[PDB]
Amino acid sequence: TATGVAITGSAPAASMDATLPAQLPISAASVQSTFTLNLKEIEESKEQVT
Amino acid sequence: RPIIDDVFCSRTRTAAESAITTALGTAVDEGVMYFLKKDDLRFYSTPVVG
Secondary structure, three states: OOOOOOOOOOOOOOOOOOOOOOOOOOOOOOOOOOOOOOOOHHHHOOOOOO | OOOOOOOOOOOOOOOOOOHHHHOOOOOOOOOOOOOOOHHHOOOOOOOOOO
16 A cells, blocks of 8 residues: 655554466366277278278 | 987077977987088187297
């Protein structure tokens, strides 16, 4: 604050700027995907697809 | 032409041969001969990795 006082003033009340946190979390989740492919499908798909 | 004998040799009687099954009880039919030709039957199995 920068309030206005007289010349024979009284040096007014205290003031100071405040800083704050943000805390922005990262660690509980994840995106994922699965395949579930066989071991015979990957064998018969190399003489039978071009 | 040699006569090879297997212990595990049989044949399942078909559904058209059903009056021959009730008279004998079973359908295992251990009386077979199987006049086969040698280089005409083949066996297969997949070469899956590992």
